[PDB]
Write a protein that binds this DNA or RNA. Structure first.
Lengths: 302, 88, 81, 130
DNA sequence: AGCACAATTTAACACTTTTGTCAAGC
DNA sequence: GCTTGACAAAAGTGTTAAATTGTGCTATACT
């Protein structure tokens, strides 16, 4: 009932290709590819071909893909063979296999039969690179770009080789020196390399209460404040009733109590039809009036 | 204070996206459908220089010159023409 | 090591390159922590800490050792010769 | 907090602050800011306070700073630990027990005067039920 | 792994328009 | 009560350099 033991049961059905076959299939793929492009190019060129030859090239295309799929299906074992070695690193086996199959696909598209090298020679590169590149892109819950995954792993080896040389874990300076970067950089790198923990994990230790329900929502409304805030609004409203009508309007608009949007002096003056400087002069007199003890003592506590 | 713009996806579904009035509306919008939609207004200016993805033909072409391909096709065609009546 | 010494050309292999001691240290650090046998020393009085040591465990499950009990070289309890 | 200080519940042990922004403070908040002239600071208060229901004196402090020495893990720039201790008088509610398995809560504490006392005038310490 | 190269984001900076302020005055 | 101009800080805005990021690729043979 296992999923992988089925895939292995099917790919083994195909027979591996000898050295001579790889070349033959490779020929058919290139011939079909050009023949298909040749036809499409003629329509642009407003040209025609022998009706009989045109039907021949049309069949060439059909034959090229059969070789293309047959070439893939024969080398699937190679993808699995390389995929075995990268398990447990945070990617499921099947995922590694499929990504490897993607590399295999490009190996076929870029293979060159004229160079006379066995296919598995040039396919291993693309298959290997496909799997690793995939891990850097997917293995981490918080995706880290490839270049950063690259440096993190280098910092790991530098730390491992330095670990075995010094009989102790080297500090940021040595790690920085050996790596030719600033220690503050290696610190920023070591923060990036952290992987998250599971909230669903149970940390009850006698009590079976998961980690999740232990986080304090900091944005949740504070009960006392939303009330004292409504009481501050009321206290301010009454304090403004002492000011002049024009006066209260300016202070409101300047801070945006009524419309929630602060206003530049120019904007305030445009609604009252006065210069922007006068608006500044008004605020000053009314800040000193609001600084008068009668209106303020109440507000200091708030 | 908001102006409403409509976008049409490829499948024909239309979406209303409320924007603020004092800003410039886009011509395409990532919609609730998950598909790009085009505004039904006048512009709709540009496609933003979409570039063609690399294809198998591009990879083949840059290793084989078109003459090498023509000969390989001649090999294949002469092979085909062998079974048309030719040899038996 | 087997995977390391098999994956290469040869004669470049050295013992250090062949062996990353990460699994050794990890197993030991991973044993003292997150293990049922290793426990924080219970100490609110000298007796508590003394009896935390000498306590025996099974995978009835929990018990402490006898006063004159003296374990034998392998770990067979010997009672007083 | 300075050594030898007395700390009640909610008092400050170590004063710490972390960045904060964008603030986007409420208008009613800023109007008071201008009236009283207290500039809205750019950082939020994250300071250690003694837990609710705890009290005692400060025995010692252990400060670890990145500036000089001090291998503190990646990211940490300074650490300070506060040690608080308290004399705990035996209080009604605490648990006592003998070596035979008998245990119970201290139900009451009677003044030495109104205590059953021997003919010496020697008051008894505790009274155990039969 | 490691590098090359292109594509895109981010910084940097100049330079321009705003927005707040002053002194002096209608 | 209010406006003017000089003026400097501040916030936008466009232009460039730097950095970050993403993709392609590596040819003994190896299933």
């Amino acid at each position: 009932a296992d999923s992988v033991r089925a895939y292995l049961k099917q790919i083994g059905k195909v027979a591996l290709l000898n050295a001579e076959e790889e070349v033959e299939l490779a020929k058919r793929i290139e011939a079909g590819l050009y023949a298909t492009q040749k036809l499409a190019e003629l329509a642009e060129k407003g040209e025609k071909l022998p009706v009989q030859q045109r039907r021949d090239m049309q069949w060439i295309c059909r034959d090229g893909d059969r070789a293309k799929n047959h070439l893939l299906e024969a080398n699937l074992r190679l993808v699995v063979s390389l995929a075995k070695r990268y398990t447990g690193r945070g990617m499921a086996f099947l995922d590694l296999i499929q990504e490897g199959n993607l590399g295999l696909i490009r190996a076929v598209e870029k293979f060159d039969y004229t160079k006379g090298y066995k296919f598995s020679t040039y396919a291993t590169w693309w298959i290997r690179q496909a799997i690793t590149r995939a891990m850097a892109d997917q293995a981490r819950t918080i995706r880290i770009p490839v270049h950063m995954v690259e440096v993190i792993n280098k910092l790991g080896r530098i730390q491992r080789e330095l670990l075995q040389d010094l009989g102790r874990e080297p500090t940021p300076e040595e790690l920085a020196k050996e790596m030719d970067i600033t220690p503050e950089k290696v610190l920023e790198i070591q923060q990036y390399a952290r992987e998250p923990i599971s909230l669903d994990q149970t940390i009850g230790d006698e009590g079976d209460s998961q980690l999740g329900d232990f986080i304090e929502d900091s944005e949740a409304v504070v009960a006392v404040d939303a009330v004292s805030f409504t009481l501050l609004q009321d206290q301010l409203q009454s304090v403004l009733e002492t000011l002049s009508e024009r006066e209260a309007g300016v202070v409101r608009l300047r801070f945006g109590l009524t419309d929630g949007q602060p206003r530049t002096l120019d904007e305030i003056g445009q609604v009252y039809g006065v210069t922007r400087e006068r608006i500044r002069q008004i605020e000053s007199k009314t800040m000193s009036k609001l600084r008068h003890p009668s209106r303020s003592q109440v507000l200091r506590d708030y | 204070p908001r102006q409403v713009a409509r976008y049409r996806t490829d499948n024909g579904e239309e979406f209303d996206v409320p924007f603020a009035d004092d800003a410039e509306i886009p011509g395409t919008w990532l919609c609730r459908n998950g598909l790009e939609g085009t505004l039904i207004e006048g512009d709709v200016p540009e496609p933003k220089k979409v570039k063609p993805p690399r294809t198998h033909w591009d990879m083949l072409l840059e290793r084989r010159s078109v003459e090498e391909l023509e000969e390989l096709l001649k090999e294949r065609l002469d092979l085909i023409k062998a079974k048309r009546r030719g040899t038996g | 090591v087997r995977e390391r010494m098999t994956t290469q050309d040869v004669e470049a292999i050295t013992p250090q390159t062949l062996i990353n001691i990460r699994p050794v240290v990890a197993a030991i650090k991973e044993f003292f922590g997150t293990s049922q046998l290793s426990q924080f020393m219970d100490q609110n009085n000298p007796l508590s800490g003394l009896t935390h040591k000498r306590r025996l465990l099974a995978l009835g499950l929990i018990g402490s050792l006898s006063v004159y009990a003296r374990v034998n070289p392998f770990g067979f309890i010997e009672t007083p010769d | 907090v300075r050594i030898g200080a007395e700390v009640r519940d909610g008092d400050i042990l170590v004063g710490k602050v972390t960045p904060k922004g964008e603030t986007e403070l409420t208008p009613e908040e800023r109007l008071l800011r201008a009236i009283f002239g207290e500039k809205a600071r750019e950082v939020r208060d994250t300071s250690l306070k003694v837990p609710h229901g705890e009290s005692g004196k400060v025995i010692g402090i252990r400060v670890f700073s990145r500036e000089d020495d001090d291998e503190l893990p990646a990211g940490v720039n300074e650490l300070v630990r506060v040690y608080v201790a308290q004399k705990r008088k035996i209080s009604d509610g605490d648990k006592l027990a003998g070596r035979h398995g008998n245990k119970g809560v201290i139900g009451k504490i009677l003044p030495v005067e109104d205590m059953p006392f021997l003919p010496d005038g020697t008051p008894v310490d505790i009274i155990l039920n039969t």
